[PDB]
A paper describes a structure:
Going from the N-terminus to C-terminus, the overall [name] structure contains two mixed beta sheet wrapped around a central helix for FK1 and FK2 domains followed by the TPR domain consisting of three TPR repeats and one additional long helix in the C-terminus. Inside the cell, the TPR domain of [name] mediates interaction with EEVD C-terminal sequence of [name]/Hsp70 molecular chaperones.
Interestingly, we observed that out of 9 amino acids, all except one are involved in some kind of interactions with the TPR binding pocket. The valine and methionine side chains of the C90 peptide are buried into hydrophobic pockets contributing to the complex formation. The fourth salt bridge SB4, is formed between Glu729 and Lys329 at a distance of 2.79 Å. We run the Vasco software that enables to display the electrostatic and hydrophobic surface and observed that in the complex surface the concave groove in the TPR domain is positively charged which makes long range attractions for the negatively charged C90 peptide.
Numbering used by the authors:
A (entry chain A): 13 to 425
B (entry chain B): 724 to 732
The structure:
């Protein structure tokens, strides 16, 4: 009986307009937001054949089915269907075999050229979380024609629209290098999202506090610190960066100086995120190289040790002390006696509360330069801060001994 | 004055 209702009065939601997909809303939904391409759609459904036989159902599990809409993960009719729905909506869909399983069917469950009936409940729908942290939520307007995505260093031609609490502060066609958005007053989020974008892609991006302009805000755009930004990006075109192996040593050494200088500029400016990117290019290009001239090898090693020591500096200032120790380890690999490498290692280790580990680093610094006043002060700092850590640990333990004895004693009545 | 440990290369 509810199958004849949609067959009589049904909304032909097809692009081609051939009565292939007909809808009838059973229960309306709140909000005027409809799901877009690539969104993670949560639904509840019941499937009945042409005669009325219940073939497959989610309600006969009570657990919802989650899939990505407009990604060809479901029948043609469903990708067209669910796209027109509001949240909490219940609608009855009548699907022609042309928009279902065709003449082929899905035997033994679905017959050949079968007109299927569905009851779909749009439970919830979320946009694509690009880095699974909630920092970049993408909603796709248009699919790209792309075969390759731009890479960190690619020059891109894009159209950019930016809103902060509904207010548009940016609306322009801009050309820049992926990784170097700051140069064109573009937040790091765009560069990061562009690497997951295709040529001719049109998408909405919700830039959370971490992928926006951050703690400083963007005073010229009247954007406050850690404000949430919504951008509309269209990747008009791009030209990918040469891969590490696509460049000869001559190019790599020319580019090493440019990106090192560019990295130092970023560093002095306090744009440490962008400094890490520039120096990281030197590491990517020269770390594994072999079969170089005496002059080429000595030069490559100079840039490589500089990049590692500078990256340690960046990571310390970025409060990312593990990466800082990692870089110091690489640098000390190349130059086992490097003062800066040893010192910066002690700095990050003292900060990760690895006092005795850090003590040694500052001690090994004095072994190199004994006239370094700062290593001596940090050795006595390691001593003082390690004594504080044990007293604090002793107190927490003595109080948790109290808790698991004054509360655990009440476990009688 | 041992601010060298803050200087970049």
């Amino acid at each position: 009986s509810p199958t004849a209702t949609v067959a009589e009065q049904g909304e032909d939601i097809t692009s081609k307009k051939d009565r292939g997909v007909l809808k009838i809303v059973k229960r309306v939904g709140n909000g005027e937001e409809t799901p877009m391409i690539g969104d993670k759609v949560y639904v509840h459904y019941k499937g009945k054949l042409s005669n009325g036989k219940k073939f497959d159902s989610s309600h006969d599990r009570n657990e919802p089915f989650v899939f990505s809409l407009g990604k060809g993960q479901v029948i043609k009719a469903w990708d067209i269907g669910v796209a027109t729905m509001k949240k909490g909506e219940i609608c009855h869909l009548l699907c022609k075999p042309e928009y279902a399983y065709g003449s082929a069917g899905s035997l033994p469950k679905i017959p050949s050229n079968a007109t299927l009936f569905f009851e779909i409940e749009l439970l919830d729908f979320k946009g694509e979380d690009l880095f699974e942290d909630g920092g970049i939520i993408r909603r796709t307007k248009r699919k790209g024609e792309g075969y390759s995505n731009p890479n960190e260093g690619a020059t891109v031609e894009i159209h950019l629209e930016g809103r902060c609490g509904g207010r548009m502060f940016d609306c322009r066609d801009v050309a820049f290098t992926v990784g170097e958005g700051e140069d064109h007053d573009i937040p790091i989020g765009i560069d990061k999202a562009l690497e997951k974008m295709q040529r001719e892609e049109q998408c909405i991006l919700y830039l959370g506090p971490r992928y926006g302009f951050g703690e400083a805000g963007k005073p010229k755009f009247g954007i406050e610190p850690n404000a949430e930004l919504i951008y509309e990006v269209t990747l008009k075109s791009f030209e990918k960066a040469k891969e590490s192996w696509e460049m000869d040593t001559k190019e790599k050494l020319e580019q090493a100086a440019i990106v090192k200088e560019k990295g130092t500029v970023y560093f002095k400016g306090g744009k440490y995120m962008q400094a890490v990117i520039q120096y990281g290019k030197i590491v990517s290009w020269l770390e594994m190289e072999y079969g170089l001239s005496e002059k080429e090898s000595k030069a490559s090693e100079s840039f490589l040790l500089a990049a590692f020591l500078n990256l340690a500096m960046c990571y310390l200032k970025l409060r990312e002390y593990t990466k800082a120790v990692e870089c110091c380890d690489k640098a000390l690999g190349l130059d086992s006696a490097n003062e800066k490498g040893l010192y910066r290692r002690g700095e990050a280790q003292l900060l990760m509360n690895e006092f005795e580990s850090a003590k040694g680093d500052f001690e090994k610094v004095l072994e190199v330069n004994p006239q370094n006043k700062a290593a001596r002060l940090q050795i006595s700092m390691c001593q003082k801060k390690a004594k504080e850590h044990n007293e604090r640990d002793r107190r927490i333990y003595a109080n948790m001994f109290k808790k698991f004895a004054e509360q655990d004693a009440k476990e009688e009545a | 004055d041992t601010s060298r440990m803050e200087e970049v290369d």
